[PDB]
Amino acid sequence: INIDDILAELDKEVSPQQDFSDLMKSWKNERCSP
Amino acid sequence: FRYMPFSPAGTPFGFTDRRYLTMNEVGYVSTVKNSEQYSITVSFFDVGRFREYHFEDLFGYDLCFLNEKGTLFGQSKTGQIQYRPHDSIHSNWTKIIPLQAGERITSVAATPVRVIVGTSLGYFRSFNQFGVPFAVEKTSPIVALTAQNYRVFSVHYSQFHGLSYSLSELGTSSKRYYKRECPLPMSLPNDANLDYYNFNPMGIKSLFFSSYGDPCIFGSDNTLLLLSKWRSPEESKWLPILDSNMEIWKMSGGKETTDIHVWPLALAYDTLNCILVKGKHIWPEFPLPLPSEMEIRMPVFVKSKLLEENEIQIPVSMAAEEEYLRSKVLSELLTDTLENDGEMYGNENEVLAALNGAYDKALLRLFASACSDQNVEKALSLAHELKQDRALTAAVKISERAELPSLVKKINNIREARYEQQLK
Amino acid sequence: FRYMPFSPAGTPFGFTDRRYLTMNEVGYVSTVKNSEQYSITVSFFDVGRFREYHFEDLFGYDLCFLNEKGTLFGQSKTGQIQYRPHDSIHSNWTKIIPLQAGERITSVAATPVRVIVGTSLGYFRSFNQFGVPFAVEKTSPIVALTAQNYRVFSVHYSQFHGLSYSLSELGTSSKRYYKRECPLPMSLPNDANLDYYNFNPMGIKSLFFSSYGDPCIFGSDNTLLLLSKWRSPEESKWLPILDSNMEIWKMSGGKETTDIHVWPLALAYDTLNCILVKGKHIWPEFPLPLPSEMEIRMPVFVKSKLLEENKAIEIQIPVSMAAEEEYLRSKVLSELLTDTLENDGEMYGNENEVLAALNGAYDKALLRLFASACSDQNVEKALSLAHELKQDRALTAAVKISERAELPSLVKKINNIREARYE
Amino acid sequence: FRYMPFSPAGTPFGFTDRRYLTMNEVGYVSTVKNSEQYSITVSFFDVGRFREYHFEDLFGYDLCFLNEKGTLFGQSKTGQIQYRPHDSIHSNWTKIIPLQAGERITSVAATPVRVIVGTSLGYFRSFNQFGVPFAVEKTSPIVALTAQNYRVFSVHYSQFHGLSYSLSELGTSSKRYYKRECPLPMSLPNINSDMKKDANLDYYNFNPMGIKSLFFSSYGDPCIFGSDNTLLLLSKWRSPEESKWLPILDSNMEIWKMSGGKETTDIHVWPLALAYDTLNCILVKGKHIWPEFPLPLPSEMEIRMPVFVKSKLLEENEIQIPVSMAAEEEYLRSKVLSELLTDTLENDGEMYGNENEVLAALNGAYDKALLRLFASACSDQNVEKALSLAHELKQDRALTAAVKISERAELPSLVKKINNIREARYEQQLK
């Protein structure tokens, strides 16, 4: 018995933090690769 | 039996020589012995709108009540009070209370309009916020007193009457009483902590108010009560919501221990801020540690039936019933606060909405177990409480998966009667 | 003080090793302790409706409550209960009640819609008939419980303040109380009767409801109490309506026999069914005797006045004392029924004629006192009862009795009430 | 614990063989112990209207209650009463109450309409003057009772209840309650060990609750006088949730204020009944606190609120009081009499015809002494203490004279706040 999909429809009826997590991820990949 | 002066969450001297006098959700007041005199500190939990100070005592104060507007001090033998407002513009004043032979002062109160001094023979003297007296009234002896924005809560007691609260509201001119001397469900007491029971015989640690306007009281049973529906004259119930003998037993790994205790400060929406004192002596010491938190749980667990399932892990078949009660209780304190007075902050509607979403969801962990053991009547009555209508058709798809086909008809019989209700 | 697990009309062991646990109008329970377990013997009074079953008690159930639908047991120390309907289709579920260190279970109760368990720290746990809780609440400690279709009776007693009832009802929407802890006008007590007080220290024998919705209680005071107008909080008053010790002296005809003990069972609008216990024990034993019924009687008679009256020669009471009882019994029993027909509807259909029987007897019981009022040549003794009569045919009959007594001034006073009563 | 029978303001035997039974504004009645019988003597206070008569007691009528219409008696072991009115307008009939094993009767009552007898286990047995029973009702044990034309006032006590009063009313055909079994703020006599040698043991062996007298007002509000030596008074009893117990008088202050700072204990206070504002008394002066034959004249005494300090009167030297203290006492003492009197008018009306005149005479002296605080507060330069005093002035003419007080204080900023209170009355008064 899984109610999570039935709960996932109950509530429904680019983001500036995610850009900074990608600049921090692309910076660590830079300094160690040849 | 003796009367002792009471102040919210005070602490005695012990072998040391510095104690707190009050401790609530604004600041804490400490005192320090100079053999001749005392040095009183008034330190605050908030920083922005307030400053701290300290001054020198020459009388021996042992009663206080610290809140937002002022700081009402007191003296337990000579009958001498002093009122020190936090503002620099308004000046202080001092008045000396009439006392008869063999009389004390038990507790004081510092409402934004009135100032209440209740003594240990029953007198109820009420000033105004500058020092003009208004009344003298005779009631039962008073052993505790507190207040919020306009309301006043108190605990009477005699040697033959018995415990009784009283909950009034001195407004601008309205003096609407709500409960006048109704009885109160609490258990008084009957070692390292023998120094405590000489200090406070009544056993009430610290009574206070909520942040929403609901009285609480933390007894010596270590069980925080709460009052509901107090705007109604005939519906008041005392809902217990926390056992400090149980939250410690879970966190100690299923074990009796005599090291962690509970000292409360205030209440929030659903959390209790606590000074987890660790040691034999159950009062906190100096300096005051950081106030931790603790959640509220309705007392439905068993001390024995968890141990046969082996920190402590709970099966879901027992954890489901507790969340059923807890969102049921919290709704009745929230659905009336909006309807009668209203909301203060503005975000009160969305937490109300998400609390209903925990109500129907926690029922469906139980509703599925009722179909698992081939029971149609037990699982029928549970579908009359879901005020959320989008979970009604959600239950029908759980009815077919357990293959109780007559039960599938009955839920659709419920939906139609609540469907015709809306059209009228 | 010790808190003991009270059960309705329950008797202790005594020297024997078989005792009862309950008693009411539909059934009773006896238990016998064998070598290793207990043998609970459910046994009914009605045979035309239900069937007897009985089995082995695995834990030592010592609390019980028997109603028209089912039964409910429980162990006071460990805290395990059991609910068995008399129908075979519905199931018997077993739930374990959470307890603390040093705590008993005082009493249990069973409604056709709810189930209540009250402990000795004050918790008031409420279920439904399948085992889904509704609330956990905190009140004063409880020593007795009693339910009917919608309404629950309770009795509280703290170690400090105590002796106070609280008549609640469990509505379908919200529990709306009617008396929240009002004080109880009943007296705690001040060898075969030694173990009755080590088993039930309060001395409450049996508390119940009526069949017209009015609570009662029979304690160790040996007097039947009854609450009138319980719905309105303005005029709710207790009316003591039966002395149990005075009816014993009335049937014997001048003999005070101290080995007849009374044991009430139920109420049926006029009569009290009893167990005329004879012996050193005030409680009955094996086998249970027959039901015995007593017509209800006010405590308005004097011990000494009936002694000197019945000195020359059942107790013969004079008419001067006889119509005094009949007036009050017509006065109490009138008011109890009029609000019930006004608010609960008819149940038996013939209720409106019964009021004419009391109101008819209301007139005659005053008129035998009315001649008892004027025969002592005192004018002041009689004129107030001309108000206290109800009917107009009574005041018509009140003018003919005043003429033969040669009171011309009392004739015109009864006439003046007619100008008040015709308007 | 042992119960004892009760009567309003009744002295014990002491050591002699004559004592009083009751004492109120009608008259004092007394017995003299014949060695085998007893001899009642019924004396009045108004001799031009009614007349002193007496007879012989053959049964020990030690419970009594005297009023304007009749004079009831009673024995607390036989349960036998007899209603003997003053004039020859009624007979003297006798009805015997059924008593049980160990039971007693503690008090009686005498109203113009009904007769009430309560026993020591709660059988509230109601009669009338015409002698018929009404209902036997079961309440808590009763140790005190009094009444007036319809209402009754009782005091219950148990070993399992504690002190609790009850204010009900016998109407025409229905009895209604107002405060059924509410708890009571009264001190019980804390009898210590040295009082078993004191001269007052025989009083406390006679009366353990220490209630010397209870009575109604001249207008109909309840009172009491316990062992605290204070006169309590219940107000606003018609509203069921706003009852107040105001101690209007303390005897332990008027001894010390009138003895000139002496702690002399040889004078005592004994109440009889309460007037409009003054209190009639019997000033006993001796080693025994109860009055003895012949009784002194009924003297008057004015009421004082308890707002005076013992210590602060010692540096001010009959002890004299300053004007800095006398306004505040008079402000309170005129405030509660302006609360009791008004609600009797708007529910009942006039009882003697002169109620509006004493009403308007009181609100003026209230507003007059309120100015004395205003002149002391402006000289100490606390202008917000002055503003708080302003809203209480009831008459508009009180606001007018207060403007002239402000100009001698040289505060042109304060006077702006006062005049805006004055015009703010004008908008609401037109609604």
- Shortest Cα distance from B287 to chain C (angstroms)? 35
Binary contact (D140, C385; C-beta < 8 A): no
Handedness of CA C307, C313, C314, C316 (dihedral sign): negative
End-to-end Cα spacing for chain D: 62
Per DSSP, the residues of D68-127 read: SS-EEEEETTTTEEEE--SSTTS--EEEEPP--TT--EEEEEE-SSEEEEEETT-EEEEE
Q: At B377, is the secondary structure helix, strand, or coil?
A: helix
- Shortest Cα distance from A30 to chain B (angstroms)? 43
Cα B22 from Cα D263, distance rounded (Å): 40
Chains D and A touch (3+ CB pairs under 8 A): no
Resolution for this PDB entry, in angstroms: 3.8
Q: Which residues pair with D20 in a beta bridge?
A: D30
Per DSSP, the residues of C104-147 read: -EEEEEE-SS-EEEEESS-BEEEE-TTS---B--B-S-EEEEEE
Cα D321 from Cα D37, distance rounded (Å): 55
Query: What's the token pair of residue D33?
Result: 């112990």
Cα D72 from Cα D109, distance rounded (Å): 8
Per DSSP, the residues of D20-78 read: EEEESSS-EEEEEE-SSSEEEEE--S-TTTS--EEEEESS---EEEE-SS-EEEEETTT
**Which H or E element spans position A8?**
helix A4-8
How many CB atoms within 10 Å of residue D239? 12
How many CB atoms within 10 Å of residue B364? 20
Experimental method reported for this structure: cryo-EM
Q: Which of C132, C138, C178 sits opposite B185 (nearest CB)?
A: C138
Asked if residues B70 and B54 have their Cβ atoms less than 8 Å apart, the reply is no
Give per-residue burial for D130-151: e unless 16+ CB within 10 Å, then b. Answer: bbbbbebbbbbbbbbbbbbeeb
Cα D281 from Cα D298, distance rounded (Å): 6
**Which H or E element spans position D370?**
helix D355-379
**B186: Cα within 13 Å, side-chain hemisphere:** 29
Burial degree of B108 (CB within 10 A; 0-12, 13-18, 19+): buried
Query: What's the token pair of residue B87?
Result: 């503002």
> Closest by alpha carbon to C193, among C281, C286, C285, C259?
C281
**C62: Cα within 13 Å, side-chain hemisphere:** 20
Cα D296 from Cα C286, distance rounded (Å): 74
> Closest by alpha carbon to C216, among C234, C187, C238?
C238
How many CB atoms within 10 Å of residue B378? 21
Q: What's the distance, CA C276 to chain centroid?
A: 17
Binary contact (D162, B160; C-beta < 8 A): yes
Cα B384 from Cα D306, distance rounded (Å): 62
Asked if residues D257 and D318 have their Cβ atoms less than 8 Å apart, the reply is yes
Binary contact (B183, C90; C-beta < 8 A): no
Q: Which of C100, C158, C178 sits opposite B162 (nearest CB)?
A: C158
Question: What are the DSSP E strand ranges found in B58-202?
Answer: 63-66, 71-74, 80-83, 93-96, 105-109, 114-119, 123-128, 135-138, 142-147, 151-156, 164-169, 179-183
Alpha helices (H) along C44-90: none
Burial degree of A22 (CB within 10 A; 0-12, 13-18, 19+): exposed
Cα C346 from Cα C365, distance rounded (Å): 27
Which long-range CB contacts under 8 A does D348-354 form with residues at least 24 apart? Answer: D351/D219
Does A8 contact B at CB distance below 8 Å? no
Q: At A21, is the secondary structure helix, strand, or coil?
A: helix
Q: At C49, is the secondary structure helix, strand, or coil?
A: coil
> Closest by alpha carbon to D23, among D279, D248, D298?
D298
> Closest by alpha carbon to D391, among D416, D431, D412, D420?
D420
The DSSP secondary-structure symbol of C393 reads: H
End-to-end Cα spacing for chain C: 62
Cα D69 from Cα D48, distance rounded (Å): 16
> Closest by alpha carbon to B162, among C304, C133, D158, C194?
D158
Cα B374 from Cα B411, distance rounded (Å): 16
Tell me how far CA of residue D20 lies from CA of D5, D106, D350, in angstroms: 14, 17, 35
Q: What's the distance, CA B8 to chain centroid?
A: 12
Tell me how far CA of residue C422 lies from CA of B44, C395, C408, in angstroms: 78, 12, 22
Asked if residues B364 and A2 have their Cβ atoms less than 8 Å apart, the reply is no
Q: Which residues pair with D175 in a beta bridge?
A: D170
Mutant choice from D132, D157, D175, D181 vs C, greatest count of C C-beta within 10 A: D132
Burial degree of C420 (CB within 10 A; 0-12, 13-18, 19+): exposed
Asked if residues C292 and C261 have their Cβ atoms less than 8 Å apart, the reply is no
Binary contact (C369, D140; C-beta < 8 A): no
Binary contact (B138, D163; C-beta < 8 A): no
* Gapped junctions in chain C, after residues (C–N > 2.5 Å): 190, 313
Contacts of D67 (CB under 8 A, 6+ apart): D26, D110, D111, D112
> Closest by alpha carbon to B304, among B312, B316, B296?
B312
Q: Provide the pairing of β-strand B264-267 with B237-238.
A: unpaired
Binary contact (D185, B140; C-beta < 8 A): yes
Q: Cα-flanking dihedrals φ and ψ of residue D357, to 5°?
A: -70, -40
> Closest by alpha carbon to C234, among B110, D58, D177, D303?
D177
> Closest by alpha carbon to C262, among C224, C235, C234, C231?
C224
Query: What's the token pair of residue D287?
Result: 């080693």
* Gapped junctions in chain A, after residues (C–N > 2.5 Å): 13
Contacts of C169 (CB under 8 A, 6+ apart): C150, C151, C152, C175, C176, C177, C178
Taking phi over 0 as left and psi of -120 to 50 as alpha, with beta for the rest, D265 belongs to alpha
Binary contact (B361, A1; C-beta < 8 A): no
Angle CA(D7)–CA(D12)–CA(D16) in degrees, nearest 5? 145
- Shortest Cα distance from B372 to chain A (angstroms)? 11
Type of residue numbered B76: S
Rg of chain B, C-alpha, whole Å: 26
Cα B206 from Cα B266, distance rounded (Å): 9
Cα B263 from Cα B282, distance rounded (Å): 8
Contacts of D353 (CB under 8 A, 6+ apart): none
Cα D213 from Cα D229, distance rounded (Å): 11
Asked if residues C220 and C205 have their Cβ atoms less than 8 Å apart, the reply is yes
How many CB atoms within 10 Å of residue B75? 19
Does A4 contact B at CB distance below 8 Å? no
Does A7 contact B at CB distance below 8 Å? yes
Burial degree of B6 (CB within 10 A; 0-12, 13-18, 19+): buried
Burial degree of D431 (CB within 10 A; 0-12, 13-18, 19+): exposed
> Closest by alpha carbon to D130, among C369, B64, C305?
C369
Cα B256 from Cα B259, distance rounded (Å): 10
The DSSP secondary-structure symbol of C283 reads: S
Cα D202 from Cα B286, distance rounded (Å): 57
- Prior bond to B287 cis, omega within 30? yes
Q: Which of D241, D243, D388 sits opposite B132 (nearest CB)?
A: D388
Alpha helices (H) along C296-391: 303-309, 319-343, 351-374, 385-388
**Between C392-404 and C408-421, two packed helices, what is the crossing angle to 10 degrees?**
170
Handedness of CA A11, A16, A22, A24 (dihedral sign): negative
Q: Given the structure tokens 């007018």, which residue do they identify?
A: D400
Taking phi over 0 as left and psi of -120 to 50 as alpha, with beta for the rest, B322 belongs to alpha
Asked if residues B136 and B173 have their Cβ atoms less than 8 Å apart, the reply is no
Chain C hits for D139, CB-CB cut-off 8 Å, are 185, 238
> Closest by alpha carbon to D38, among D73, D84, D85?
D73
Question: What are the DSSP E strand ranges found in C13-74?
Answer: 18-23, 27-33, 38-44, 54-57, 63-66, 70-74
Q: Cα-flanking dihedrals φ and ψ of residue D256, to 5°?
A: -80, -30
Asked if residues B399 and B408 have their Cβ atoms less than 8 Å apart, the reply is yes
Cα C304 from Cα C316, distance rounded (Å): 13
Look at chain C and count its residues: 423
Chain D hits for B90, CB-CB cut-off 8 Å, are 384
Alpha helices (H) along B258-404: 316-340, 348-372, 377-381, 392-402
Binary contact (D308, B164; C-beta < 8 A): no
Cα B81 from Cα B99, distance rounded (Å): 13
Query: What's the token pair of residue D208?
Result: 């353990």
The DSSP secondary-structure symbol of B84 reads: -
Q: Given the structure tokens 């004018």, which residue do they identify?
A: C379
Chain D hits for B130, CB-CB cut-off 8 Å, are 382, 384-385, 388
Q: Given the structure tokens 């015995």, which residue do they identify?
A: C292
How many CB atoms within 10 Å of residue B155? 22
**Which H or E element spans position B18?**
strand B18-23
Asked if residues D269 and D283 have their Cβ atoms less than 8 Å apart, the reply is yes
Look at chain D and count its residues: 431
**B418: Cα within 13 Å, side-chain hemisphere:** 15
Look at chain B and count its residues: 424
Mutant choice from D1, D138, D167 vs C, greatest count of C C-beta within 10 A: D138
Query: What's the token pair of residue D174?
Result: 């229905």
> Closest by alpha carbon to D296, among D269, D326, D317, D323?
D269
Residues of B with CB under 8 A from a CB of A: 357, 361, 364, 368, 390-391, 394, 397-398, 401
Burial degree of C380 (CB within 10 A; 0-12, 13-18, 19+): middle
Contacts of B129 (CB under 8 A, 6+ apart): B69, B70, B83, B112, B113, B114, B115, D388
Q: Given the structure tokens 């049937």, which residue do they identify?
A: C251
Cα C217 from Cα B344, distance rounded (Å): 50
Tell me how far CA of residue C43 lies from CA of C27, C52, C263, C291, in angstroms: 6, 6, 19, 15
The DSSP secondary-structure symbol of C80 reads: B
Q: Cα-flanking dihedrals φ and ψ of residue C268, to 5°?
A: -135, 50
Cα B402 from Cα B375, distance rounded (Å): 11
Look at chain A and count its residues: 34
Q: Which of B162, B225, B381 sits opposite C160 (nearest CB)?
A: B162
Angle CA(D206)–CA(D211)–CA(D212) in degrees, nearest 5? 80
Cα C324 from Cα D134, distance rounded (Å): 10
Angle CA(B245)–CA(B247)–CA(B249) in degrees, nearest 5? 70
